[PDB]
Structures are given as structure tokens and as C-alpha cells.
Design a protein around this ligand. Structure first.
Ligand SMILES: O=C1CC[C@H](N2Cc3ccc(N4CCC5(CCN(C(=O)c6ccccc6)CC5)C4)cc3C2=O)C(=O)N1
Ligand SMILES: O=C1CC[C@H](N2Cc3ccc(N4CCC5(CCN(C(=O)c6ccccc6)CC5)C4)cc3C2=O)C(=O)N1
Ligand SMILES: [Zn+2]
Ligand SMILES: [Zn+2]
Lengths: 341, 791, 374
């Protein structure tokens, strides 16, 4: 039972209200080469459709973004396996002078995947916009279970093709996703294979070594296949520094925000953490005091949690600040500290 | 530990002297307080006739004669350092003489710190009260009524904390005190009147004044002049009501004046004594209208450095010294020879301060003699003491350390003299400037009117005690240690001197030397010279090697076949190893703050490793190894302590204090030896003190310890102490912080007094005592005679 | 040159204003045995006279402090030899003198300022139901020794033992006249000067002046005990030496050990990797009247003994400058850590306003430093 508002984390209100919302989408051509300013401090693999909050303080990046709001509000987040990358379009912007320095905090959203042709030193990346390899229905190339039996039978009456069909693969992934999104709404997930696969890739706790592989896949059918394969394979997560300490299991994963189990948030000093929300965690010591300052899930207070065998920060424990809320406690584990098994 | 302390030689330094009519209304008497002894002499034309000698259970700090109305002869007030106050009388019935105690008490305050200026004690001229200054901001008044047998005292608060000196004024209708005090504004003279009925102070007869920035002595001038005289470093001023006089003679600026004495009952003539031994006469001029006309100072001459003065009669003056022999001198109207009016008549021996000593069998007859470095400055000398006969060898400079070299038949004496920067000029001919042969140190290593210490090593003959050789050390060099030993496998015997390089700009020395000299064929030859990075505080021969202390390090040196000192091992202690003693392979290390550290040398491992330790904060002046388990030391407030050395490491590594005693003396040196021809007593340790008293410590068996402790506890009940001070209070280990009873020590002087009591008293003491047989007087006489044999 | 108000750091303004302040004092008999509650999370060696700020948030600690403010305001701080496996033989009592209660960011927190009062030895430690330990401890006496010359001082020249209050010439005359009677003993005057409270205090001031360029003499206490404790509180030394200094009962021994530490210390290295030199004793300087080093509490109740230095080396700056909760008002901190081992060493403080003096300095946390002694 969950009664928390799953649309609160997505707004990133810890960054402050009254942010100048930039409305209007910009896209490049499916082949055209481009020169894009690369942000040098984000060591993250952005995914199209994924939201990236940032807090920039360094003068060079502040000026870069300040001039970039006027022009196309697009910068480049490189993969840093830097061979591939994504283009992020700023859609919320603000400047302040909190605690001594001028600070620009923004919210961008990954737009397009590109290959790194060259980098010239704020770096400028000359990159190529990789297209989207969308395929037509295979069975049309040469021509609650009853509905799908009718599907797999009547649609493929011209006949394995079900294993590679976009609709059936999306339905299988959705079936495996309902375990997490207890409040799943059929309108919450997108209606096309492209956005669906991108969201699924965004919300998986897989290691970067496989996030890169998912990013470089150009076909939605293949991306869905790979996502399903990994979703089935992965079972438990362990402390990265130990590689021998299980912290949680895939059955404890749950989605407290509409973006999914995992999402990226900035802490007060600009460091981005991809936090995965889970019901239970093990082998973790709580350090310090509970605080609600700059909380990423409004209504909850965070307490630092670290592995009890090596004292490596694993994440935080969020505890409800008012009875009648559900869940009362959960754990937000940072991706960099977790290794799948 | 069960020890036994006796006094081989009583204190000789004179700390006080007064003159009066004590024994009889006609007899002119001189009373001398040395440390614990009180000598009463009758002054005669022939000199002094010793009438009585008394022992006090305390260090006499105040000693005054006063005659209240109704008494035929003077009474004596004595305060001790433990604050035992007493009023005594001289009672005589035929040949029998004894000191009656007219009153007694203890005037200590439960709280309050002693004033830095020390205990002051004054008596009103009319004998209406006794005023004591023992603690800051308080003034203790003891009313002198005929029935205050307990010496009940009351305090009066003083608004001026830093009081320099204070006196009772003559001629005042009510008891008035004139005193000098210091506040940030400077030094001022103030007066108060004392109200016994109101128990407080009233405004003084005349106003407050301002005196010299270093005015430090107050003299109360009797009638008819009245008033007071303030004596400071540059000026002599006189105040009496509105009347005021001042002089600034130039003959007193060279040295501070620290003692005085009135020659005439009218205060027309006074004696003054300076720190360097100059005796002056201060004259007051009379005019009839009676008022004082003018002051003038005339230098009388040179005496031994005076601790106190007392004019007796017919121009004879007694000079009591702490740094030298006490003197009886004559004042002549006509100047003689250089121009001095002072002719020394008689001299009285003073072995103090005994800063170092050694035991030597000079005649080889198997009976030890003791050679001590006594005196300071122009009073320094060597004293040879044997079974008690004393021979003196003046040096006219300060001896510091002494050693004996039997092979070369000579003593090595570290000495220092004071020179004035003027090139530096010697103030007088001394031992180090009149040697038959002399040398000066030369090593590649390393205002006007100022005084500098020039150090020397003197080689002195054991037969005639002539200064055979004098070796002067490097400029700004301080010679600290001195040993005479054979090192390594070398057959030669050497003098080894450890030094430090002392610069006023440097708080802690950073450079020092170890110099190995050899004395042969009439010359002293520098054989080796090793530079070290600190002060060589102590040095001991150690199994043919040389153990030395350099600041906080204990270093071991070997005498290589090429005649050089080569480091063997180091031990880096946290404390400064001032005291360094050895026995077998054990080393005792001590510092000035009572920290004791027992280490052992490992012949196989070739290193130092700690055995035991005992760190207790207190000032320590000497240490000694009684045996392999018990260590004797001298501790602040004139105390002796004995530390002792479980199966648990934390316990075996801790020394416990198994003995405490209050000696009443400041022990400068210990040394194993004895002065008697060579039993219940095992061992022997002589010790020498600041006051010139030589003492002896031996060890006892527990059976004998208990027997003598019971004899002590039974003697205290028969022996009538003077001032009625209790022996257990006297001998209690005392420090400004705490007080404990004596443990592990037998007061041998009390025991030896057993032979002076009468036979009935002996029977009373020995009654119901078990020797298994019931002990009798004769048996205890045997015990005490055997105990007295040890010295 | 400096123009910073050195009294600002000691007021701990970052802890908020309007803190209820208590006057008076609670002192115990020098030998009495007492029972004192122990604050658990304090892994600090407190020294008498030193100021300890705290932000407590555990319900047990909050309740214990709330009870304490209604009683004697004294709790115990135990000097652990081992940070883990709590094992304390000595400690000191801290008396709360400022206090404020709040409920900031979801929980109730009590911020207090206490000051060390009295040392003690750990006789017993007992756990309690609430979880607040109770220590049975006997107070330790602060022994005071007289002048070494008081035993041999001659009576005749006692009256000369007062000097006109007041430089090389004055101290030479002071040694000459105060230890004149050293001639009666076996040691020289310059030896007894090494055990004199006044001379040792002056020698220590001659280095406190090297650190604090504009040091005012009036600020320092005018008695050896308080002076020694104040100096001990501000020395960048590891826990072993701090505990050793804590158990020294004599003020003269403590002054001598502090002087030895000041003379011998050469450089300060990163504790994790002992081979890298972070700074040198000549860079240390005093930004507050408490001394070069002082205890400050961060927003989450952690106490850091920060030593201020003019220059430091082998440090990487991480994150962003910030003036939030700054311990030195008007300056912005930046996390600094060893560039060999990436271990937190402290912060770099940079002045926000131009013309501020100094414009930059470093505050190094004591627990991450190791002084090298020759
Ligand atoms: O829901 C949530 C979950 C929690 C999350 N939060 C809050 C937060 C606050 C602060 C910092 N900091 C990260 C950087 C920082 C580290 C500590 N600092 C030193 O000086 C220092 C460093 C080492 C040792 C001693 C002191 C200051 C700088 C502060 C990071 C975070 C963060 O992740 C959030 O925002 N909301
Ligand atoms: O002049 C000065 C000097 C600086 C000093 N400051 C400020 C400060 C702010 C915050 C924390 N923190 C210490 C504890 C803390 C750690 C970070 N956090 C995580 O969640 C987290 C942990 C690990 C990885 C990622 C995130 C929040 C909790 C925050 C410590 C400090 C501190 O010492 C001060 O106050 N003034
Ligand atoms: Zn781990
Ligand atoms: Zn390091």
C-alpha cells in the first residue's frame, strides 16, 4: 500500500519554485553533424527522455549555459565509457546567489543520441546525430489471456515472430514492470516502442558497462529485447567496494516516482545521484541525524546509510515525517555504489 | 624500609642572633639561633662564655626578647617554621638550668598561602602584643596579656597585599605599625594603629608617603627622635610626622643593605651590613630646640658576609654568617692599615653550605675522613672533618664539586669566581688566580660593570692542601660534573669534567663538552675533548665505561684504544637527568621535580631498558641508592623519603614510598661512607646540608626497628620538649600541600638522648617493655651505646 | 597583516543567536568521588578551560541534557585511548553555559556550549536504561608548587624578593635576584630558571606572539595553571600526547612539556599516508583569541578541532565555495583533501569581501594530521 504522490519527485521542487520554464522543443536532423557544448562535470550516461537536474557554480559553465539559453538550449552529455553521448535540452532555468557565489540551476531532458567525431577544447563536441532504426511489422513484410491468444494467432496467421513484435515485447516488459509500479496507469507509460524502451532503459539499475550498450542500440525492438533479457537475468544488488555484500534484491525494488524505480537528483553541492528506491535494505549503518533539508521526496527525512563492512556510502534511508503516510520508510540507493549480480 | 638517622655534626650556620638580659637582670646575654639549636652566651670582657645550649623541635624563624611589666628579666619569643609559637623563660636554681615554657601554641591558619617575603615577627615596644606576618593580606595579633597561656591570636585584614617590611613605632600612644608596601603606583610607606578592643586598624599617626622604588628596610628609631628610617638601594630616608630627611650616599650603591642593628639605646648609631660583607655605620645627628639634624653614612670595614649583626658592648660586634664563619670583631676609633676600623677578634666555624663532599682515607689507617666544599663567594673553602676535629683550607672563591684521585694523591675541585667586565677583572686574589701552575682552555669548538662567572678545575695536594694547578675553562662555560675514574682498559687515571655553554639569550643550553684531563709530572694535560649537544649534568663511571646525562638523554661512552669517547647506547627520557646514580648494572635517574626512574643496563643486548618509575610532583634536592631495592632522597620542605621496588607488570614497574621523615635540613649531597673505625646497623650514608649539619643514615632490621619505635613512643612521654612541641608533629613529613606522620625512620637523636635522663626516668621509660624477658634500663643502655658507636 | 575580528570565532555565531546563557559555576572537592552522566558521541579530548559546542539530536541525549539544565550543568567527557572499543582512564567535566532548543528540519535538536572545568580519573563506568552512561570518577587535584628557592631562601634578603612589575635586561635582573640563593645548592641559576613558572610562561608567550602577530598580553590568564591549560588546548598534537598532557597534574611540568612540543614540532603530515607533508609549524597562525586551534561543530553535530594556517600544500579543492554555517564569518569554505590519498584534511577559507585580511587561509582538522617530532 502506497499513498505518496508519485508526481512530486518528478518536479524536482527541492531545486526551488518559480523556475523560468522554457517551453519549445528543438531537434536536429537524423544525419546532420553538429557542434555542441559539452558540460565537463557530469559523469553520467544520459538517456533520451531522461530528466537531468544540474546545479552549476563554476564561472565557465555558468557563462556557457547563460549564453546557451539564448541560442538553442542544447548541450552534450558524453557517455564516458567518450565515444557516444546524448543531447540534453534545457527546459527549466534559474540563477541565484545562494551562500556567496552566483549559481545557475537548470533542468534539462535528454533528446538525441550521437557519436563523438571529435572534441575541441568548455569543450565543443563535433558529433553526428544517430537516427532511430524503427522497423515495420515483420509479419507484414511478406504476408485476460484470450485477447492475446487471438493476437498471437490472428495477427501472425500469415506464418517466433511474437518474440520480436513491438507490441508483444512491450506487453511482456509491462507485465514484468507491474511488480514495481504498484500504482501503474496504462497512460503513465508511453504509447510507442521508442519512448517506452528509452524509459525502461533509464529506470534500470544496470551497470554503466551495459547502459552504454543499451544506448548504442539503434532499434527499439532490439532495445526492448535487451532490456527484457537483463530484467530477467538480474536478481540482487551488492556493495560495489565489497562485491561480496548483498544490499537488496530485485523483488524489493519499487517505484516512488512516475519516472520509475530510479531517477537522478542533484544534492546541494551539484553532485548528481541516480537514486533507486527500495522497500528494504540490509547490511547498512545509519550515520548522523535525520534531516528534511533539500529532500528529494517531499515529506520524508533522509539519513545517510553506508555499507557496514567497508563504510562506503550506499545511499540514504527516507523515513516519513508524519503518520498516515505510506510507505513509512524506504531506502534510496545510489547507482554508483551498487553492483548487480 | 627501616632506617635510622643521626646527626654527626649539628648545624653551624647562624640564622638569628639577639642581645638582651635573659639569664639574669645584670648578665648581658647573646642568644644565637642556628637552625634548631639555641645557644645562650654571657658576654664578658674576655669574649663569650657559653652558658647553655638547647634543642628545639622546629626551625627557629623568629626569635625576640621582650620584657613585660612585672618581670625582672627578659622573656624569649620563638616561632618555628611549622608555626609553633612559644614564650620561654630562663629558670636557674643553683647549678641546675632549664628553660621554662611560659606559654605556647600553634598560630597556623587552616587556609592561606605563605607570603613570598617570608615570616615577619615584631613585638610592640611596650609589650602589648606580638604582630606576625605569615600570609598575604592578613596580620596576626597575639595579645600579650599575663593569662594568654595558649597564645590566642586574631587576624586583621590588610588592604595592601605586597608588604615588604613592617615595624612597631616607638613613642606612639597606641600600638602603631609602620610598613612599606608595593602597588602598581610604586612603593609607599604607610602607618596603622592597632586596636585590640576593636580588633582592627585605625588611621596611623602620620600620613602615607612615597619612598625609593626599591626601598626595602624599615628601622624604628627610639626616643627622642622617634619616627622611622627607610633604607633602599640608593637612598636613606627618615620620616617622623611632618619631619622628613633624605640622603643618597654613593658608598652604598655598590651593594644592597640587608641587615642592621642599633648601637645606642637612643638610636644615634646603627650598624648596616651589605650583601658583599661591607659593614657601615649610620649616624643620626642631635639638635636641641630634640630633633634629628642630619644623616650620614661612614664605611666601617669588611666582615664575613653577614646574615645578622648584634652589638654587644665596648665596641665588640658579633657577625652571624650563613655563607662563612661567624665573627666577633672590634670597632676602633682610629683607622688602621688600609683604613678599616674593623679588627676581627674571634672566628666560629661554619661548614655550611655543604654543596658537595667526598670520603677519603687520607692516612690509610682504615678510618674515613670527610672533605667538604663549604661556603660561597669569598667565604668558600674546603673543610676536612674527622673523628669532631675540623681543618680549614680557604679558597676565597666558590667550590662546587670535589673528587679524590688516590693514584696522583690530589683532589680535583671545580670552582668558580666572579669577575667584573672592565676584559674581565678579578675582585680579589683567590685560589684559582694563585696556583703554582695554571692553564687556559683553547678549543676550536663553538656590557660594563657586569659580573661573569669564571670556572676552574683546581688540582690540590692532599697533604698541604696547596693549589698545585688551576685550569681555566672556556668563556661562558659552566663546569657541572666531575669524576675521577679509570676507563676501558687504559691504565691511566683521569679527571673527567662535563660542561655546558651558557648564553643569557638561550634558556636551555645547546652545546657542552666532556673533557678528559690527566694530571702527571706537575701539569694537567687535556687528553680528550668530546662535544655534545647539551649540558652534561652528571657523570658516573659504569663498569669501566662513562655514563653521562646530556639534557634529557642518558648516554654511555667507551674509552677506545685510541683514547676517544665512543657512544655505546642512548636512553631518551622525558625528564632532565639531573641526578645519576649507579649500583651494579642498575641506574637511578632523577630530576628536580621528584621524578625517579630506575633503568638497567643489559650487557648482552647492549641497551637501556626501564625497570621502575615513580613520578610525583615535588622539588627534590638529592638522591641515593641505599641498596638494590631502596632509594633515598631529599624532598621539598626539608624532608627525607625512601622509595622501594607483585607478579604483575603494572605493579613491578612502580616504586612505592615506604619511608617519610621531616629532617629540618636541606640536603645538598649524599655519599656512602663513615667516619668511625671499621651489628644491628647495616650500611652507612653521610649527608651534607645547607646549614652545615652533617647527618648519617643507616638501615635496621624490623625487630630492631620495632624495639626502637617503642622506645621512641615511650621517650616522648618523659622527655620535656622546649616550647612543648610534640615530636610526632616535629618529624611529620610536611609540605605546603599536605602532612603525613613519619614512617620507616627512627629519630636517632631522640634515642641517643636516652642516656641523658635520670635513672628513675630510665625505669619509667623501660617499664612493661619486652627485650622475651622484660627489658630493663641496663639492656637499653647497651642498645643505645651500640647505636652511638656508629658515629 | 590581519584585520579580522578575532573575537568573532569564539562567539560561535554560526550556532545561532539568542542562546540562553547560564551564569555561576559548579566545582567539586579536589578528592571527592562523584557520579556524572557521559555524553556518548564526543570523540574529543576536552581540556579544562576549553569551549565545546554541541548539536545533540538523539532523544536520550536531549532528555539527559534537559534534565541536566535543571540540575548541576556538568557532564563527563572521557579521554579514550582507542576511538573504538571505548577505553578511558581519564577525563574532564564540562559545564553547560549556553543552551538552546529547536526542532529544525523534522527533529528536535538541542545546541549547547559547555566549557571544561575539572579533570578526573575513571573509577567505574555503568550503563543505564536510557543509554546514557554514568561514570564514577574522583576529581583530580591541580597541585601547586612553591618557588624552588623557598626552601633555601635566606631570611636576610627575603625583603628583596619583590620586583617592580615590568626587556632582556629586566629578565636577567629577575634571574639574578630571584635565584641568588642557588649558590647554597648544587645547581646554577639558569638551571632553576628552567623550572620557573614566570620564565616558562614568558618563553611560551614569545611563541604565542610568533603565531598571533598582534597578540595582546592582557588576554592570556595571569596564573600558570590557566595559562598551561590554555596553551595545551591549542597545540596540534595527536591523541597520545594530548592524553599525556591531560594527566600532568603540575602546571610547571605541563608548561615544560608544551614548550618542548612547540620547540620540537617541525611539520604536519597527512595521518592516513604519513609520508606526505601538508604544512609546517611556521605557517600556523591564530585567527581567534582562543589560539591557532579551536573546536567547532558542523551542521550535523560533528566536532572538528580546526587549526588555522596561512599556506598548505598537497591538497585538492573539491566542490564549491560556500558561506553556509561558516565558522569564520565573512569567509567561504571549500572542502580540501589529500591529493595522494583523497582523505579529508580540512577546508580553504577565502574572504568574500575585498580588502579583508587575510584573503585566504586553511583550516585543517586535527584528527587528520600527524606532527613529526625530531
Ligand atoms: O533527499 C535527499 C538525500 C540526501 C541528499 N543530500 C543532502 C546533502 C547535504 C550536503 C552534502 N554535501 C556533499 C558535499 C559536502 C560534504 C560535507 N562537507 C564538508 O565540509 C565535510 C566533508 C568531509 C568531512 C567533513 C566535512 C561539506 C560539503 C556537503 C550532500 C548532500 C546530499 O546528497 C539530498 O539532497 N536530499
Ligand atoms: O567553516 C566551516 C567549514 C565547513 C563546515 N561544514 C559544513 C558542512 C555541511 C555539511 C556537512 N555534512 C556532514 C554530514 C553530511 C555529509 C553529506 N551528506 C550526504 O548525504 C552524503 C554523504 C556522502 C556522499 C554523498 C552524500 C549529508 C550529511 C553533510 C558537514 C559540514 C561541515 O563540516 C562548517 O560548518 N563550517
Ligand atoms: Zn561494502
Ligand atoms: Zn593523505
Amino acid at each position: 500500500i502506497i499513498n505518496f504522490d508519485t508526481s512530486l519527485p518528478t518536479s524536482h521542487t527541492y531545486l526551488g519554485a518559480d523556475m523560468e520554464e522554457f517551453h519549445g522543443r528543438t531537434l536536429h536532423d537524423d544525419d546532420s553533424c553538429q557542434v555542441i557544448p559539452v558540460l565537463p562535470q557530469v559523469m553520467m550516461i544520459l538517456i533520451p527522455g531522461q530528466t537531468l537536474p544540474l546545479q552549476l557554480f563554476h564561472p565557465q559553465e555558468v557563462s556557457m549555459v547563460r549564453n546557451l539559453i539564448q541560442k538553442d538550449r542544447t548541450f552534450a552529455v558524453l557517455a564516458y565509457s567518450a565515444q557516444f553521448g546524448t543531447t540534453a535540452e534545457i527546459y527549466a532555468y534559474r540563477e541565484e546567489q545562494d551562500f556567496g557565489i552566483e549559481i545557475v540551476k537548470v533542468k534539462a531532458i535528454g533528446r538525441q543520441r550521437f557519436k563523438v567525431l571529435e572534441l575541441r577544447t568548455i569543450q565543443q563536441a563535433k558529433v553526428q546525430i544517430l537516427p532511430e532504426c524503427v522497423l515495420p511489422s515483420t509479419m507484414s513484410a511478406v504476408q485476460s489471456y484470450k485477447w492475446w491468444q487471438k493476437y498471437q494467432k490472428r495477427k501472425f496467421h500469415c506464418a517466433l515472430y511474437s518474440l520480436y513484435d513491438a507490441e508483444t515485447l512491450m506487453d511482456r516488459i509491462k507485465k514484468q514492470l507491474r511488480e514495481w509500479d504498484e500504482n501503474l496507469k496504462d497512460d503513465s507509460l508511453p504509447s510507442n516502442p521508442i519512448d517506452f524502451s528509452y524509459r525502461v532503459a533509464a529506470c534500470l539499475p544496470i551497470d554503466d558497462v551495459l547502459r552504454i550498450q543499451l544506448l548504442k542500440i539503434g532499434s527499439a525492438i532490439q532495445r526492448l529485447r535487451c532490456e527484457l533479457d537483463i530484467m530477467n537475468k538480474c536478481t540482487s544488488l551488492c556493495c560495489k567496494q565489497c562485491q561480496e555484500t548483498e544490499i537488496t534484491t530485485k523483488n524489493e525494488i519499487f517505484s516512488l516516482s512516475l519516472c520509475g524505480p530510479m531517477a537522478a537528483y542533484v544534492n546541494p553541492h551539484g553532485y548528481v545521484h541516480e537514486t533507486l528506491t527500495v522497500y528494504k535494505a540490509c547490511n547498512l549503518n545509519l550515520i548522523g541525524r535525520p534531516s528534511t533539508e533539500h529532500s528529494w521526496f517531499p515529506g520524508y527525512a533522509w539519513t545517510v546509510a553506508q555499507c557496514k563492512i567497508c563504510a562506503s556510502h550506499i545511499g540514504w534511508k527516507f523515513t516519513a515525517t508524519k503518520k498516515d503516510m505510506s510507505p513509512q520508510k524506504f531506502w534510496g540507493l545510489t547507482r554508483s555504489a551498487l553492483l548487480p549480480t | 624500609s627501616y632506617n635510622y638517622v643521626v646527626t654527626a655534626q649539628k648545624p653551624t650556620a647562624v640564622n638569628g642572633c639577639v642581645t638582651g638580659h635573659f639569664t639574669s637582670a645584670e648578665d648581658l646575654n647573646l642568644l644565637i639561633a642556628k637552625n634548631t639549636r639555641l645557644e645562650i652566651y654571657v658576654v664578658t670582657a674576655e669574649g663569650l662564655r657559653p652558658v647553655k645550649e638547647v634543642g628545639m623541635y622546629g626551625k627557629i624563624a623568629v626569635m625576640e626578647l621582650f620584657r613585660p611589666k612585672g618581670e625582672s628579666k627578659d622573656l624569649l619569643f620563638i616561632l618555628t617554621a611549622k608555626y609553633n609559637a612559644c614564650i620561654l623563660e630562663y629558670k636557674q636554681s643553683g647549678e641546675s638550668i632549664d628553660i621554662i615554657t611560659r606559654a605556647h601554641g600553634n598560630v597556623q591558619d587552616r587556609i592561606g598561602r605563605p607570603s613570598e617575603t617570608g615570616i615577619i615577627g615584631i613585638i610592640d615596644p611596650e609589650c602589648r602584643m606580638i604582630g606576625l606576618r605569615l600570609y598575604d593580606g592578613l596580620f596576626k595579633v597575639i595579645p600579650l596579656d599575663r593569662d594568654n597561656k595558649e597564645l590566642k591570636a586574631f587576624n586583621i585584614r590588610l588592604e595592601e597585599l605586597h608588604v615588604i617590611d613592617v615595624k612597631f613605632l616607638y613613642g606612639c600612644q597606641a600600638p602603631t605599625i609602620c610598613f612599606v608596601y608595593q602597588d602598581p603606583q610604586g612603593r609607599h610607606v604607610k602607618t596603622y594603629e592597632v586596636s585590640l578592643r576593636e580588633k582592627e586598624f585605625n588611621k596611623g599617626p602620620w600620613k602615607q608617603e612615597n619612598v625609593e622604588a626599591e626601598a626595602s628596610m624599615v628601622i624604628a628609631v627610639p626616643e627622642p627622635f622617634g619616627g622611622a628610617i627607610i633604607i633602599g638601594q640608593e637612598s636613606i630616608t627618615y620620616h617622623n610626622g611632618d619631619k622628613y630627611l633624605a640622603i643618597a650616599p654613593p658608598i652604598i650603591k655598590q651593594s644592597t643593605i640587608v641587615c642592621h642593628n642599633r648601637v645606642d639605646p637612643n638610636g644615634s648609631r646603627y650598624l648596616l651590613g651589605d650583601m658583599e660583607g661591607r659593614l657601615f655605620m649610620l649616624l643620626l645627628e642631635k639638635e636641641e630646640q630634640v630633633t634629628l639634624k642630619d644623616l650620614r653614612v661612614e664605611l666601617l670595614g669588611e666582615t664575613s658576609i653577614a646574615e645578622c649583626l648584634t652589638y654587644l658592648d665596648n665596641g665588640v660586634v658579633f657577625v652571624g654568617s650563613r655563607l662563612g664563619d661567624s665573627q666577633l670583631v672590634k670597632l676602633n676609633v682610629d683607622s688602621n692599615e688600609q683604613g678599616s676600623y674593623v679588627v676581627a677578634m674571634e672566628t666560629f666555624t661554619n661548614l655550611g653550605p655543604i654543596v658537595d663532599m667526598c670520603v677519603v682515607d687520607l692516612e690509610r689507617q682504615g678510618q674515613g675522613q670527610l672533605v667538604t666544599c663549604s661556603g660561597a663567594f669569598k667565604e668558600g673553602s674546603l673543610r676536612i672533618i674527622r673523628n669532631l676535629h675540623i681543618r680549614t683550607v680557604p679558597l676565597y672563591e666558590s667550590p662546587r664539586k670535589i673528587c679524590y684521585q688516590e693514584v696522583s694523591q690530589c683532589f680535583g675541585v671545580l670552582s668558580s669566581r666572579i669577575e667584573v667586565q672592565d676584559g674581565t677583572t678579578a675582585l680579589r686574589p683567590s685560589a684559582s688566580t694563585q696556583a703554582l701552575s695554571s692553564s687556559v682552555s683553547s678549543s676550536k669548538l663553538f656590557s660594563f660593570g657586569e659580573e661573569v662567572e669564571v670556572h676552574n678545575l683546581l688540582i690540590i695536594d692532599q697533604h698541604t692542601f696547596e693549589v698545585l694547578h688551576a685550569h681555566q675553562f672556556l668563556q661562558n662555560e659552566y663546569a657541572l660534573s666531575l669524576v675521577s675514574c679509570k676507563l676501558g682498559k687504559d691504565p691511566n687515571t683521569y679527571f673527567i669534567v662535563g660542561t655546558a655553554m651558557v648564553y643569557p639569550e638561550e634558556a636551555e643550553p645547546k652545546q657542552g663538552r666532556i673533557v678528559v684531563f690527566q694530571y702527571s709530572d706537575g701539569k694537567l694535560q687535556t687528553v680528550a675533548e668530546k662535544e655534545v649537544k647539551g649540558a652534561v649534568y652528571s657523570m658516573v663511571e659504569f663498569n669501566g665505561k662513562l655514563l653521562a646525562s646530556i639534557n634529557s638523554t642518558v648516554r654511555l661512552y667507551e674509552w677506545t684504544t685510541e683514547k676517544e669517547l665512543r657512544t655505546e647506547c642512548n636512553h631518551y627520557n622525558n625528564i632532565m637527568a639531573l641526578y645519576l646514580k649507579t649500583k651494579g648494572d642498575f641506574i637511578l635517574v632523577g630530576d628536580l621535580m621528584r621524578s625517579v626512574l630506575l633503568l638497567a643496563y643489559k650487557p648482552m643486548e647492549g641497551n637501556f631498558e626501564e625497570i621502575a618509575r615513580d613520578f610525583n610532583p615535588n622539588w627534590m634536592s638529592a638522591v641515593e641508592i641505599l641498596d638494590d631495592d631502596n632509594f633515598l632522597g631529599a624532598e621539598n620542605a626539608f624532608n627525607l623519603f625512601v622509595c622501594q621496588k607483585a607478579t604483575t607488570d603494572e605493579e613491578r614497574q612502580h616504586l612505592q614510598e615506604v619511608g617519610l621523615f621531616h629532617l629540618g635540613e636541606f640536603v645538598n649531597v649524599f655519599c656512602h661512607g663513615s667516619l668511625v673505625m671499621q651489628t644491628p646497623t647495616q650500611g652507612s650514608v653521610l649527608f651534607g646540608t645547607v646549614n652545615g649539619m652533617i647527618g648519617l643514615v643507616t638501615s635496621l632490621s624490623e625487630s630492631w626497628y620495632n624495639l626502637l619505635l617503642d622506645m621512641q613512643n615511650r621517650l616522648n612521654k618523659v622527655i620535656k620538649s622546649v616550647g612543648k612541641i610534640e615530636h610526632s608533629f616535629w618529624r611529620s613529613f610536611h609540605t605546603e600541600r599536605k602532612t603525613e606522620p613519619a614512617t620507616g625512620f627512627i629519630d636517632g637523636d631522640l634515642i641517643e638522648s636516652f642516656l641523658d635522663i635520670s635513672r628513675p626516668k630510665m625505669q619509667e621509660v623501660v617499664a612493661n617493655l619486652q627485650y622475651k624477658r622484660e627489658a630493663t634500663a641496663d639492656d637499653l643502655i647497651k642498645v643505645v651505646e651500640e647505636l652511638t658507636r656508629i658515629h
